[PDB]
């Protein structure tokens, strides 16, 4: 099936007038439905819309480092159009120099991806959480504080664990692609290096090759020991080996929805 | 070599009088060298000894979980005898029902443990943090909120990352054993189920060799592809190879230091 695609988090950074700082700070105090703390004239913090939006202002940090002085954070999938309009009119519009600092792509699949092998052709860090079973439940590729980070994990299990309403599907896995700083502008093709695979090594006829791969695919630590020219050889081979690569479906769904998603972004920037 | 062993964290939980709550709350306010916040009559938080000791009191949250109402947290390796005596006299003594909630065993090794891994006789959950190189830096066995949790990680790398003074040894790895709640009393012979192992093939110097074996050990059909002259080379190699189990050295060092460690505990409970 085609995976559902959506933005899953958005950060927006901007700068705020002396006049507007207060104006906005003033406004917020009057509304009991917003939660205010860490207040000074140069500082404030806030959560709004039943704690779905984080809002932070700090000028002295902003002056200390040559940066923008207000962030707004939230997940658009959990906001109501009504709400989105409220937030734009009452917060975002009053920011200047405003743009995106974060942007997350969420591909939901109704398959089980435990059984796929997820890989980057690039030489980066990883993290794997295994279940009691010895099988993987959550995978991270890259590091969170970076231009690009990827999670692949069992959404069903994660939703169940979070006491969310249970799901009609028998399997549900997400593939989240966190784009920060300048990478946000390339969201429409950000999983070029990424592949989600599953091959059948038997059908291959070179013997040492098959062993070597089989090991790489069954002890992730063994990548750590391999010479760099070697790493590339086996990266090549892995990709070269598998029939169905879900990358292709992702790229497709992305293209199919590029225009809507694009509009959805444009909305915030006007 | 024999690994250095020590307790690496201690939590102490107790209960505090109405009288003593204030008394202590009063005492602390007078010392500018201790940092007080989140104050109510039922609540208070504090860090002392240059932020090395956390201290938290909460009556409303003690009973709401059916526990004792004050924690004191700290790493004994980073405290001065002077300091330890200060803390006992000015804090711990005024607690009643006092006992240990947490206790961590730290085995430092001057070897490289990258290729070693732990297994209980259970198939518990796991976490592995890999470096950019593809090698493992940190391994977790179990879950942190439990009677028992184990970290094995590169202390050298972790100390370097923490901007600690660099170390004369070329390798330094720790094996931390976090014991909580009732398990603390059994710090002393846990390893009937447990082994810190290196599998057969891991022990080999040679990448191609170790791959080839791993495959032979995990796919029966791969013998069928191999002329006899090869089979023997790997037959030879297999027999030639043993698992290394560090458990034994740990049990030993533990026994060797049981009495000191035991005294070191007794100190706090008087």
Residue numbers in the entry:
A (entry chain A), B (entry chain C): 39 to 308
From the paper:
In Gram-positive organisms, the smaller plasmids often replicate via a rolling circle mechanism, a process mediated by a multi-functional replication initiation protein (Rep) encoded on that plasmid. The Rep proteins possess two related catalytic activities, a type-I topoisomerase-like cleavage activity in which they form a nick in the (+) strand at the origin of replication to initiate DNA synthesis, and a religation activity to join the ends of the parental strand that is displaced during replication. Despite low overall sequence identity, there is a high degree of structural conservation between the catalytic domains of the Rep proteins from these Geobacillus stearothermophilus and Staphylococcus aureus plasmids. Structure-based sequence alignment reveals the conserved residues are almost exclusively located in the β-strands containing the Rep_trans motifs, and it is likely the crescent-shaped catalytic domain represents the canonical fold for the Rep_trans protein family.
In this report we describe the structure determination of the core domain of replication initiator protein of cryptic plasmid pSTK1 (25,26) from Geobacillus stearothermophilus (RepSTK1 residues 1–269 (27), hereafter referred to as RepSTK1). This was then used to aid the structure solution of two staphylococcal Rep variants, RepDE and RepDN (containing the 21 kDa fragment of RepD fused to the 14 kDa fragment of RepE or RepN, respectively). Constructs of RepDE and RepDN spanning residues 35–314 were used for crystallisation studies, since the first 34 amino acids are predicted to be disordered and had previously been shown to be dispensable for protein function. Crystals of RepDN belong to space group I213, but the data were near perfectly twinned (refined twin fraction of 49.8%) giving an apparent space group of I4132. The twinning severely hampered experimental phasing; however, it was possible to produce some partially interpretable electron density maps using SIRAS data collected from seleno-methionine labelled crystals. Molecular replacement with the RepSTK1 coordinates was also unsuccessful, but manual docking of fragments of the RepSTK1 model into the RepDN density allowed further interpretation of the RepDN electron density maps. Crystals of both RepDE and RepDN contain two molecules per asymmetric unit as a non-crystallographic dimer and the final structural model spans residues 39–308 for all subunits. The relative orientation of the catalytic domains in RepDN is intermediate between those observed in the other two proteins. They still form a ‘horseshoe’, but are rotated 5° towards each other relative to the position in RepDE, reducing the distance between protein chains at the open end of the ‘horseshoe’ by 5 Å. The different conformations adopted by RepDE and RepDN demonstrate the catalytic domains can move relative to one another to modify the size of the cavity containing the active sites.
